[PDB]
Amino acid sequence: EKKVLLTGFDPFGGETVNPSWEAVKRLNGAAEGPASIVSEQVPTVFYKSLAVLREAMKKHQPDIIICVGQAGGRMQITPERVAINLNEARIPDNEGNQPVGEDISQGGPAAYWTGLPIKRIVEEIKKEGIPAAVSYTAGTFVCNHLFYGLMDEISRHHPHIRGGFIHIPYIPEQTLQKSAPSLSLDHITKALKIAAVTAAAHEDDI
Amino acid sequence: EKKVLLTGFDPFGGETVNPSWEAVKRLNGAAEGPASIVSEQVPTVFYKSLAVLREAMKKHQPDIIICVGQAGGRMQITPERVAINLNEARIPDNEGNQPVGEDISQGGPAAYWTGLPIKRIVEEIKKEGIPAAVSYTAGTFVCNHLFYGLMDEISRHHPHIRGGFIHIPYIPEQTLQKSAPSLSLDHITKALKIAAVTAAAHEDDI
Amino acid sequence: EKKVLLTGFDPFGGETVNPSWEAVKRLNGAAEGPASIVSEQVPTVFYKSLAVLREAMKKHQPDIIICVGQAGGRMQITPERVAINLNEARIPDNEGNQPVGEDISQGGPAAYWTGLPIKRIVEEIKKEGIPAAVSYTAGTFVCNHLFYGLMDEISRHHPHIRGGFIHIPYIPEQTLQKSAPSLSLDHITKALKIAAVTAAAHEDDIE
Amino acid sequence: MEKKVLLTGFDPFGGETVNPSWEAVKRLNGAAEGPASIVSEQVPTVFYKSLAVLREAMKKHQPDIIICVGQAGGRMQITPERVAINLNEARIPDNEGNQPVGEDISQGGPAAYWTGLPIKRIVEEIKKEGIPAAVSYTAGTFVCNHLFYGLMDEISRHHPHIRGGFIHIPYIPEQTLQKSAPSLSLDHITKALKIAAVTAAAHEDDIET
Numbered sequence A, B: 001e002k003k004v005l006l007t008g009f010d011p012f013g014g015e016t017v018n019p020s021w022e023a024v025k026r027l028n029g030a031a032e033g034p035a036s037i038v039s040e041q042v043p044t045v046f047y048k049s050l051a052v053l054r055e056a057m058k059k060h061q062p063d064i065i066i067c068v069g070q071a072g073g074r075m076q077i078t079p080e081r082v083a084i085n086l087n088e089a090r091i092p093d094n095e096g097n098q099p100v101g102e103d104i105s106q107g108g109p110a111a112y113w114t115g116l117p118i119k120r121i122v123e124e125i126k127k128e129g130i131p132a133a134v135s136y137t138a139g140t141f142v143c144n145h146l147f148y149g150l151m152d153e154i155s156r157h158h159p160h161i162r163g164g165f166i167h168i169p170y171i172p173e174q175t176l177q178k179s180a181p182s183l184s185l186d187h188i189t190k191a192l193k194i195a196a197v198t199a200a201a202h203e204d205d206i
Numbered sequence C: 001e002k003k004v005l006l007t008g009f010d011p012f013g014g015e016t017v018n019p020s021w022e023a024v025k026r027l028n029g030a031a032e033g034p035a036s037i038v039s040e041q042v043p044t045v046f047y048k049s050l051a052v053l054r055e056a057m058k059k060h061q062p063d064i065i066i067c068v069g070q071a072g073g074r075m076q077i078t079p080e081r082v083a084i085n086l087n088e089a090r091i092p093d094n095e096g097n098q099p100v101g102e103d104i105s106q107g108g109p110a111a112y113w114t115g116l117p118i119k120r121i122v123e124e125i126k127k128e129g130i131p132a133a134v135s136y137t138a139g140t141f142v143c144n145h146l147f148y149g150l151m152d153e154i155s156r157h158h159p160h161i162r163g164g165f166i167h168i169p170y171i172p173e174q175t176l177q178k179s180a181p182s183l184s185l186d187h188i189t190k191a192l193k194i195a196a197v198t199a200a201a202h203e204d205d206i207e
Numbered sequence D: 001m002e003k004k005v006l007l008t009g010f011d012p013f014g015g016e017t018v019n020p021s022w023e024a025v026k027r028l029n030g031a032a033e034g035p036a037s038i039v040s041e042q043v044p045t046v047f048y049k050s051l052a053v054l055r056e057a058m059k060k061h062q063p064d065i066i067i068c069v070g071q072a073g074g075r076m077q078i079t080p081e082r083v084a085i086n087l088n089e090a091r092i093p094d095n096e097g098n099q100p101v102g103e104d105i106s107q108g109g110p111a112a113y114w115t116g117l118p119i120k121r122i123v124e125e126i127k128k129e130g131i132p133a134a135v136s137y138t139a140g141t142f143v144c145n146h147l148f149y150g151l152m153d154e155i156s157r158h159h160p161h162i163r164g165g166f167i168h169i170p171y172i173p174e175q176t177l178q179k180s181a182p183s184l185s186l187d188h189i190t191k192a193l194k195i196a197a198v199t200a201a202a203h204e205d206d207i208e209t
Helices: A019-026 A048-060 A118-127 A142-157 A185-201 B019-025 B048-060 B118-127 B142-157 B185-201 C019-027 C048-060 C118-127 C142-157 C185-201 D020-027 D049-061 D119-128 D143-158 D186-202
Strands: A002-009 A035-042 A064-070 A082-084 A111-113 A162-168 B002-009 B035-042 B064-070 B082-084 B111-113 B162-168 C002-009 C035-042 C064-070 C082-084 C111-113 C162-168 D003-010 D036-043 D065-071 D083-085 D112-114 D163-169
Touching (some): A002 A019, A002 A048, A002 A142, A002 A185, A019 A035, A019 A064, A019 A162, A048 A142, A064 A142, A111 A142, A118 A185, A142 A162, A162 A185, B002 B019, B002 B142, B002 B185, B035 B048, B035 B185, B048 B142, B064 B142, B064 B185, B082 B142, B118 B185, B142 B162, B162 B185, C002 C019, C002 C185, C019 C035, C019 C064, C019 C162, C035 C048, C035 C185, C048 C142, C082 C142, C111 C142, C118 C185, D003 D020, D003 D049, D003 D143, D003 D186, D020 D065, D036 D186, D049 D143, D065 D143, D065 D186, D083 D143, D112 D143, D143 D163
Parallel strands (some): A002 A035, A002 A064, A064 A162, B002 B035, B064 B162, C002 C035, C002 C064, D003 D036
Antiparallel strands (some): B082 B111, C082 C111, D083 D112
């Protein structure tokens, strides 16, 4: 048994829904394969998102952590390969912070690689008929920020944890006024469940 | 009670599945509100497709006809506004026909407008959380051919019939090797059923 | 010699430039082979654009007419195969009109085919290293309005004229705030010149 | 203060017969503008060997600034790269048949290197001339990223005074005749790179925008 902590973000302004949370919330308390899943919501706010993540880690003592966020415009479930040490916000987060050219960790490394077996994850999702691909940029907003902070916290304080980040597309209901790709909430939920089982069943990637 | 005939195409050019047929097949025999639905498959073949449609029309005597086809790359359910008198194929149909610069109907008009209340359809589909928009080009392959042939048949032989065409996106499992937008088969099916019910309930568009 | 009238639209929406006018403006007075070019600007306004085109048609008595317009988001020079009888405006025109579900010619045909040898045109443009393809929808805004009005005017009153429409991409200076494809004004201008010369050299298209 | 700026472009790859990165920087070899004195060299689209060729060009020119340029087919803007990652991950073989997968470029080296060029300034000066530009946060995992990372690694370990980075550019029109795709004219691309070289030569420090 591996305790798998999944996080999803709260609503960002304009959006009334944040599917990353709606999808992971459905998996809370699930026992799938060797995974025992718990889910916690994180604010779409720089700095504060990391403190909420630290408290969830303290609370659940996870073996595996998968943070989930929305990347509108994408067409596949996309596990992220790398997190970078930079907050570069084009619009403000939920509490008005709009960092520009800012280090996430003063003196920390320029990047952290994911600790999850993402190539296996991508393949198991595709095996089930859901598109997926590895991404090499998680952006520079709060999603990458949480990804970098997660890996920084793992590296400095809880190295036994295998953690990473996964971006998901919009769900159909978010694309009614301006056309854009989406995947249904059921498919995204199923893909995150597969990612959790896969990570729990395999430390090593293919 | 209006008899609604839906058609979907058979698998084409490498695909193993044609979602236009998988979706309409599910509605064969369904009765909802003023709609009594029947479905028939049509070959992705120029000229022969029109022969199969005419037989379906002869057999079912529909009041309304909605032909459905796949438009890979689109991200919304898209009812078509206009059919044009032209077969222009960049690749061969399923029987090797590759017409170029060819009239669909010698002496027929340059175009036919759809006979369905497509704005109503788009709105009812979006009210159910599924992306939809009117399209102004059905292409120049077998799908536009069937649309033009349908309208020419209606014009020629059964002017009280209300007919038209609706393109739909890829389903997820067709987008595993090359990234592209898709909508789930359940959502496409629901959208087509809404189109059928809406067309049966209203003769006039909004 | 064939006289080729080219038209380009003024800036619309929130643009400050319109590549269709910038490019055709450069070709006014150009002559090459069988073609002699004259250019006129048309306002991005429903109804009024057709009256302005009729005035240019009377002024110049052209043998060939190529109306040009901006199709932001496209990546190639795109001659249009078909004009449809419908004004369906997603945004208001330059004077505020925003027609919806409106016939352009009451009782006119649902569509008019282009009268230009567009396959020849796309091939001659690609021969020069510039991307081009036939388009089967010119939209339902002022560009398609003008294209339909032009073909209706030709069919009814001046069938000797070979006329049609060519959409072109944004030019680079229009994509500085939001990423979008563009073609340089030099390349667009060269393509339109090729289009004029080709149309003037051949009434018949290829297959 | 005059600055020697070494520009590099790649040879054609993947079925292409021209590579706008080399066609553009080639035109700037020997150019002088503002405080920039520009020299250009071609680099092969081959893992390992590309870095050896870059090191030879560096020895040869003793540049103050280095801007490696590559083609990013599909992009619609000139895009200076913010970051280089320690990974060779090839979806297709390079020009000599190498197709590394999951490979560290520098075993134990940092996961990434930031660019040393003033890229926010470069993007602004390019947009001021009416050419689209934007910062990119991924240079891919093919030979362009490989060259970018190897350049920042060489600067870091052996010549920290050099200001170096990478700029990806779109296809030129002639490469998009069979399948639609965005492009920028060779003239505009060449002008954008010239601007990048003059801007980097004129300013060690980047602006913040």
